[PDB]
Amino acid sequence: GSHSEQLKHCNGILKELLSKKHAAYAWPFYKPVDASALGLHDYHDIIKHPMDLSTVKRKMENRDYRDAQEFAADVRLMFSNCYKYNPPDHDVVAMARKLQDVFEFRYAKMP
Amino acid sequence: GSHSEQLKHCNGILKELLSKKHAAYAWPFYKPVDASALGLHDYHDIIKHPMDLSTVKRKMENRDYRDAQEFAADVRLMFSNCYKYNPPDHDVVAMARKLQDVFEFRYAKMP
Numbered sequence: 001g002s003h004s005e006q007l008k009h010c011n012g013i014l015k016e017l018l019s020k021k022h023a024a025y026a027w028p029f030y031k032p033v034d035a036s037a038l039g040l041h042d043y044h045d046i047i048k049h050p051m052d053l054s055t056v057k058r059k060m061e062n063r064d065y066r067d068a069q070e071f072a073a074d075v076r077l078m079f080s081n082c083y084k085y086n087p088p089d090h091d092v093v094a095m096a097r098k099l100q101d102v103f104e105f106r107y108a109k110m111p
Numbered sequence: 112g113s114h115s116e117q118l119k120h121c122n123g124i125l126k127e128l129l130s131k132k133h134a135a136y137a138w139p140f141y142k143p144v145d146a147s148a149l150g151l152h153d154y155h156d157i158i159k160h161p162m163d164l165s166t167v168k169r170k171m172e173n174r175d176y177r178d179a180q181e182f183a184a185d186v187r188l189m190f191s192n193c194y195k196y197n198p199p200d201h202d203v204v205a206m207a208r209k210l211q212d213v214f215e216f217r218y219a220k221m222p
């Protein structure tokens with residue numbers, strides 16, 4: 001129920017999402033989506049603001065998050081990016097869901 | 112794009128969350144959490160802002176959502192209260208995630 005200890009909580013969420021525990025679904029989000037390499041046609045038109053956990057990690061370490069709601073919007077932006085671009089039956093879409101399940105729960109248990 | 116079209120889409124989201132299709136996990140969220148009746152100790156302590164689909168439905172019928180974000184914020188709040196109050200291995204937590212999956216996806220597919 002404070003900023004400095006809430007941001008601590010979000011750091012906690014970040015570490016969990018990046019831990020070896022969640023590696024088998026989390027791995028597409030470790031780094032910025034490489035649209036060229038993966039052949040994602042029009043990825044940069046369809047997707048206004050890219051976001052991944054490495055970006056989130058950086059703003060966290062440089063202390064660029066002013067509050068928790070902001071952390072949240074970036075994390076959800078990252079998943080929404082995935083859901084927007086991809087067909088519902090896409091493998092990565094299932095993976096976004098499983099990681100987001102982890103996100104939403106620990107985020108709900110915030111002070 | 113603009114608020115009018117977005118909200119139309121949001122209502123269609125709501126409709127889907129209320130349809131028969133999702134009924135076997137959706138049903139806990141149809142109405143406000145009756146803390147008394149379910150014997151949820153301290154629910155109103157723990158949960159500052161109750162939210163359910165009837166409250167969302169009402170605001171939509173009444174045109175009380177100014178933009179799509181405001182719809183998202185209520186629907187996520189409804190899920191968040193669930194994950195906040197309950198233990199992780201609660202049936203209702205499992206049902207929330209299954210419905211949220213339907214929310215997050217179709218919401219990401221907004222024009």
Ligand SMILES: CCS(=O)(=O)Nc1ccc(Oc2ccc(F)cc2F)c(-c2cn(C)c(=O)c3[nH]ccc23)c1
Nearest residue numbers: 027028029030031032033034081082085086091092
């Ligand atoms: C670490 C960033 S990376 O770019 O360097 N590597 C990378 C590698 C595989 C990926 O996808 C798959 C994942 C899991 C599978 F089982 C199959 C996949 F194809 C994606 C990926 C990410 N996201 C957010 C998408 O929306 C998306 N759409 C289409 C691909 C993707 C990114």
Ligand SMILES: CCS(=O)(=O)Nc1ccc(Oc2ccc(F)cc2F)c(-c2cn(C)c(=O)c3[nH]ccc23)c1
Nearest residue numbers: 138139140141142143144145149193196197202203
């Ligand atoms: C809609 C009017 S109602 O709200 O009054 N009815 C109602 C009935 C059952 C419920 O839960 C169950 C779920 C799945 C089962 F298999 C068994 C259950 F009992 C909940 C329920 C809701 N929510 C948001 C919670 O956070 C929560 N925590 C503990 C219970 C709940 C609410």
